[PDB]
Ligand binder design. Structure first.
Ligand SMILES: O=c1nc[nH]c2c1ncn2CCN(CCN(CCP(=O)(O)O)CCP(=O)(O)O)CCP(=O)(O)O
Ligand SMILES: O=c1nc[nH]c2c1ncn2CCN(CCN(CCP(=O)(O)O)CCP(=O)(O)O)CCP(=O)(O)O
Ligand SMILES: O=c1nc[nH]c2c1ncn2CCN(CCN(CCP(=O)(O)O)CCP(=O)(O)O)CCP(=O)(O)O
Ligand SMILES: O=c1nc[nH]c2c1ncn2CCN(CCN(CCP(=O)(O)O)CCP(=O)(O)O)CCP(=O)(O)O
Ligand SMILES: [Mg+2]
Ligand SMILES: [Mg+2]
Ligand SMILES: [Mg+2]
Ligand SMILES: [Mg+2]
Ligand SMILES: [Mg+2]
Ligand SMILES: [Mg+2]
Ligand SMILES: [Mg+2]
Ligand SMILES: [Mg+2]
Lengths: 178, 177, 172, 173
């Protein structure tokens, strides 16, 4: 697909799908009742889109999808809502699904925004967590991979809206984003 | 296991869905293989085609870009809740849909996207129902021609449920009445 | 004139309203003579007429921001265009009834960390006494009856009235 | 007294603007006189204008707002119309038509929703609108190409609240 753009492969597709399977079961166990309402997966477009469709099928309990679209005002990160949730999450069991957590600013904003909507419960699942995100103010119950601070693309991760479609996660060549 | 007593029968198994998407991927890949230096742009309307587009994109052997539209209902009269994140002017664009039934949404979408002047505009849907086989909008890629059964699974919903299924199943009448 | 038979009685005439707004503008202008302009935040659509008249009655520089919401506790359809961090902000509302909308809005804006946050409503109804958000500026206190005009609607109609009046029971 | 030293001269006073809007409303009211006339505005330069105009139009009128933004002459819709304008008499309301590209987009977008009638009212029109192709049934004032602020018109979000329209002195830029 992208010859000369990917410097190396950090996480193979097989590794990714394997980890999601275990995350899927672990999440399935923790959420396996009294409420009668399905688990609610909340995704912020669009880097976590590939991840959430796979995670959802790996979680052995019913799961609903909800999507948020956001933009930055510039420089918890300060965040503008382009598309709000389609439904009220009041009293719902909610799982935030992120592609990567780096600074922690987005997730910090998201956790607060969703909290004041008063869900029954709020937890966080991220496929990737970078070193600066370890020891952050928002608790992340489910972490797929603890990765180094390398700029990576693939499996939903982009540089300039490219490389999102890769099935694996690879380190991008410094030439590309110079 | 997930929804016991709700699925009346399986219309399309997961193995069958992934198989057809593999063929679709190749077929799409060869067409758009045939200078511009810009990637193929996949455009999805949330939320039912979300699962489909993430599989299709990985099955298409040429670079693909993701864009998402969110719409709502008030000729297909449609309200936009979230416009495209970028200008698609001069881009080669593939509309990705979960199901085409009356063809009303697709008519609205095709014309809405046409006036943004893309280089090209084609449509790919996983499912097509009888009433849509002779609709005014041309669909270059059809995964399956299914009957007019109300189906769920693989992105398809009833009251926001059943989207997470890996297969496409017919839903029991008790559930939606 | 515009809607014959639809308005049972006038509540607030055009002149009553503009005079009150002239007063409000002066009171707000005195309070905010503080280096960024006062930021008026309005929720569409009811307070649109009000906020355009109010902004012109305020003798200090004022900027406009609009939000668009919808009830599912409300869904944001159009967010603010700018980071209100460090800004002096005035929420402008048409009517405060149950107070729930103001409650949500107040909390939403507060977590964006403005320097100051106050509320101005044209109309306050009796049920607002059971709400908890402080309102620095009130145009008029009115009874419980459903009113239309000056931005207030019944099924999108009557917003263009220059006065506020009670709706005839025949319309329901 | 609002922005001391920023305005070099007044182009259109508050009184002059209101008088013209009064004429506009009557003219528009006469033309449209069983569903209410729909005024459609793009946020937010024309908000002041549309609130005054709606009150000056002696027929029942309704408001609908749109919010757009430029993709980094086509625009991104941020807030769409709240209602279906199918079979409705629609009047687009603008603050200023300059290049005509904004109005060009908006007019095409609303046409495809099939209103019964579509017309354009703008408070101000600049000389370059002569090459815009899109017809305007109601113009408040034809004005020079010079940059003006006030009555909804901004310079980096300032000066919108002015009751009059005026010229900024080059010190501001
Ligand atoms: O390695 C990486 N490869 C790609 N992206 C990366 C990487 N690391 C951080 N990021 C950016 C992710 N961060 C910003 C994400 N988002 C904000 C982009 P912006 O609004 O332009 O500042 C991108 C949305 P999308 O999925 O559509 O690309 C959020 C993590 P945090 O710093 O808030 O904890
Ligand atoms: O078998 C089905 N199972 C689930 N849904 C089905 C089925 N058939 C049609 N549909 C509904 C598909 N519809 C797609 C969009 N629908 C919502 C998109 P989604 O978020 O993916 O569920 C309906 C819009 P609204 O409910 O607001 O009127 C219209 C297809 P068309 O008739 O315009 O060609
Ligand atoms: O007399 C009245 N005349 C018109 N409207 C009236 C009146 N009283 C309450 N209301 C409704 C005001 N409500 C405003 C909320 N908005 C939500 C209306 P809905 O989506 O139908 O629930 C109004 C949107 P708009 O400005 O477009 O008309 C609630 C204020 P509060 O109860 O949270 O304090
Ligand atoms: O004298 C003027 N004073 C203020 N603004 C002026 C003036 N002349 C043109 N303009 C810009 C008006 N422009 C209106 C579009 N918008 C410009 C977007 P931007 O590219 O970010 O400056 C205005 C949004 P708002 O109403 O919120 O301020 C373009 C009109 P047109 O060239 O498409 O016919
Ligand atoms: Mg993310
Ligand atoms: Mg990114
Ligand atoms: Mg669809
Ligand atoms: Mg549906
Ligand atoms: Mg209000
Ligand atoms: Mg109302
Ligand atoms: Mg304008
Ligand atoms: Mg401007």
């Amino acid at each position: 697909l992208y010859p000369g753009d990917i410097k190396s492969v950090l996480l193979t597709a097989e590794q990714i799908q394997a980890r999601i399977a275990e995350l899927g079961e672990q999440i399935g166990n923790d959420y396996r009742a009294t409420t009668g309402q399905d688990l609610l997966l909340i995704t912020v477009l669009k880097g976590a889109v590939l991840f959430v469709t796979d995670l959802a099928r790996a979680i052995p309990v019913p799961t609903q999808f909800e999507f948020m679209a956001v933009s930055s005002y510039g420089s918890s990160g300060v965040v503008r809502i382009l598309k709000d949730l389609d439904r009220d999450i009041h009293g719902r069991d909610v799982l935030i699904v992120e592609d990567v957590v780096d600074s922690g600013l987005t997730l910090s904003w998201l956790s607060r925004n969703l909290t004041s909507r008063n869900p029954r419960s709020l937890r966080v699942c991220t496929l990737l967590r970078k070193p600066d995100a370890v020891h952050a103010n928002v608790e992340i119950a489910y972490v797929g991979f603890d990765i180094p601070n390398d700029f990576v693309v693939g499996y939903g991760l982009d540089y300039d809206e490219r490389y999102r479609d890769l099935s694996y996660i690879g380190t991008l060549d410094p030439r590309v984003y110079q």
